Symmetry: C3
Subunit: 334 residues, 3 copies
């Protein structure tokens, strides 16, 4: 008989995050979320390569869910009849029943409601896990996201000082396994089912064909570049449900980084590159000091430049010549 | 002329650990251990794939040895005449002579006795290292284990509070390289010697055919599942002598984790997934809050589900509906 | 109008480091460095395999640059007309313009001068990054190095105690991708340009053919072994610009380790193996307790023993039988 107040959240597509408070005077609530599974063929690169995706809420990654320590998270998972497979959800933030997996298995046409208490602070992966060989396949097909469980007093630096972010972005990195035909071209399939045999043979060799942020090569570039201004403190949440990543902000730093992603631990300071362990999420905060283009990459540069894993930030403001200056422009050698 | 008291230890096969004290009032002793090398053909999967294993004491991993800071560890290594190759032992816990390697090289028919002082606390890898290209081959053939060097006052949380475990398990993860024939089937060999050429070609490509806990697919499942009860604090020691692993307790957490495995460092708290660097051991403690099945995996899920790297825990006790509850069971979508 | 004193540094080839102070009473200066790009065909292994290298100052890695927090680093980058490609430089230690990349693009025949303020302490990677698919190619061709930014008061253990090193070595690890012909032999090329197509196809498969310290198999062995004496505190700086490494000193430990490489964070103590994230540098200090040969390796032992990634230390001094002793030499089993 759990009679706490209820609060609905309207989830938003990554890399944006639904509005939330950092430090709050609210007590525990039941926070209500809904996720609807969609299986769909998507284009993942600039050459028109297709991929049989399975998603929460139609996006890779799934949306970031934000709650505070001690809240109860009540999720409605819906598997519409237009899908062909059973699905479930496992929250790394939750305790028991394989993270909820064992309580949320639903066939097409069904829905389920799980509630779990947010007893551990940090950013955590959630993903589908419908048993056996299906677990890796569903996850690398795009069925993963993250949840952020904040302390009620907001983030701190471990030395008693508040760390308040002006905005948060969620970057979900996805390793994809697209088989090639004899010619050397990527193959296309009519269904996830048909993709399965060839996709599993490739997965077991452990080398992805693509590594992408937000579902596609170039997803967070151009018009969809991340943005900030000089003086803004930005939190970047990064998740990888299956394989390690090494985030790096080219031209910046991680001023405060929780590489294991758990706010019970003090953050590390002044990082160049941090490490997100496969099956986890981490978070890094940086205060922009300079305008211009930044690239956020995994610093396996082959993955970043050749397999898809580069985002951009466009930052506005005034150039600081004390920090960096071109003393002499390119000129002929004397 | 080292005249301290002597204590013999009867080693036990993993994942169990020989009886020991955590905090102790004993002073330094000479703790005596014996390891006998066995080369043997073993079955590593459910389809009957065979593998030319080389082991300490007949198991993969080798047994966990437990001592306290300041003890002297005296190991008798025996290489019976039934073996075909020279072997040795290197302890990452020890100082000098390539970890003992340079002092323990023995041909079939010989034995040696090494003593080293346990000056550094934590869990450490030990492995065979008989020079040059043989070093990786012997290690990935199964010749590795771990030693745990406890503080005399037991483990602590870094904030002055004792951390006492009710039981400890040792999970050794092994990357195996089994070549395939033209047909696509795994190959079998009559000797380790004969396996060598094909095995080395495959090793150099860096992708394992199998990744297993305790020597075999499914070794820690079914009747040999790990066990606990709600309320029990369990320490899991995890080693990987050659390749990175990312342990994850599905349905739980790492309440206290030493991912680099060294007790001179405070543990991290509240992890979802931790990282064991190739050539190291780590340790994670969790107090079970819920009954039921848990899976302990490396959270490269392809490795976990498809290459062999999943263990189970069966936990007894009372379900806690506050922590997690199925609010509404699978029903048709309204 | 920046009128601070100027200091020139004569860079030295790795693994040596140019003379510097640890703790200093100097205030901020403009420290002046010059790097000259050389493209050249080099031999990378004992069987005579060749490789189209691109380097800073003719070495892989590029030289270590050492400054103190608050200094201004003024680098002249020179791209002589004997080179065939444009190049630039990105410092992970610097803030803005893609680490300087966006301000330092130079064609053969040109030079440029960049100045940046060293606001963050630690060891940082620098590398070429001339846009798009060229970025990984230039980096894995050898164009990377590191810079060390010291606190003005020198290193500390995080508990108020100074950590002073008696010598420092810089070990740069390079992943190389050398394609093979139909026969199975490594291919040779007349130019970097010609190597590009085949090299890029191989890079995208993510498995190196060689992994080497200081540019070549066996570079830091034999006459070029690293050296120390019992009682000496040695700092080893390790960088990897593209791919993870797991350094291990066989026979020793990391007494104090900054695995993420940033001196704003206290070091970890008593490590067996540490982890250098791709796109970063780390640093580990050890006081030698025993004489003899040590091997410093990445503890993927296949990489260490078979792909090139092993260095040696030769240490002089007196054997300590308390720490380790052969109690009984190899003898026949009774
Ligand atoms: O041209 C036939 C010849 O090509 C191979 C591939 O080398 O197979 C191709 O043709 C087969 C018959 O048309 C197809 O079944 C197959 O998918 C395709 O690779 C050989 O196996 C065959 O002898
Ligand atoms: O059928 C002969 C033909 O098959 C190949 C493989 O395509 O080799 C097979 O047969 C050889 C001769 O019997 C064996 O030595 C070899 O091990 C096996 O692969 C071809 O090389 C050969 O022309
Ligand atoms: O002997 C010709 C036969 O060999 C193949 C490889 O199996 O190609 C080799 O010879 C070609 C023609 O000389 C070369 O172009 C090629 O580089 C080499 O591999 C077959 O393709 C060909 O039928
Ligand atoms: Cu699913
Ligand atoms: Cu998971
Ligand atoms: Cu051996
Ligand atoms: Cu080792
Ligand atoms: Cu270049
Ligand atoms: Cu970089």
């Amino acid at each position: 008989d759990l009679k706490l107040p209820r609060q609905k959240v309207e989830l938003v597509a990554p890399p944006f995050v639904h509005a939330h408070e950092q430090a709050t005077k609210q007590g525990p609530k039941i926070v209500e979320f809904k996720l609807t599974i969609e299986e769909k063929k998507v284009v993942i690169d600039e050459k028109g390569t297709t991929f049989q995706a399975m998603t929460f809420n139609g996006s890779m990654p799934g949306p970031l869910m934000v709650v505070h320590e001690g809240d109860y998270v009540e999720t409605t998972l819906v598997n519409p009849a237009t899908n062909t497979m059973p699905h479930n959800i496992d929250f790394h933030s939750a305790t028991g029943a394989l993270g909820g997996g064992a309580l949320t298995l639903i066939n097409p046409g069904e829905q389920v409601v799980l509630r779990w208490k947010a007893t551990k602070t940090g950013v955590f992966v959630y993903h589908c896990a419908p048993g056996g060989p299906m677990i890796p396949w569903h996850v690398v097909s795009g069925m993963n996201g993250a949840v952020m469980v904040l302390p009620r007093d907001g983030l701190n630096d471990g030395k008693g000082h508040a760390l308040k972010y002006d905005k948060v972005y969620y970057v979900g990195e996805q390793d994809m396994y697209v088989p090639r035909d004899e010619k050397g071209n990527f193959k296309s399939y009519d269904s996830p089912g048909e993709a399965f045999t060839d996709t599993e043979e490739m997965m077991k060799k452990l080398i992805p064909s693509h590594v992408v942020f937000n579902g596609k090569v170039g997803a967070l570039t151009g018009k969809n570049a991340l943005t900030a201004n000089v003086g803004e403190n930005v939190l970047i949440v990064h998740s990888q449900a299956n394989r390690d990543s090494r985030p790096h902000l080219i031209g910046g730093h991680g001023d405060y980084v929780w590489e294991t992603g758990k706010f019970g631990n003090a953050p590390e300071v002044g990082l160049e590159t941090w490490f997100i362990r496969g099956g986890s999420a981490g978070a890094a905060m940086y205060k922009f000091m300079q305008p211009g283009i930044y690239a956020y990459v995994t610093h396996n540069l082959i993955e970043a430049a050749d397999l898809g894993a580069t985002a951009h930030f466009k930052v506005e403001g005034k150039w600081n010549d004390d920090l960096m200056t071109q003393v002499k422009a390119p000129a002929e050698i004397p």
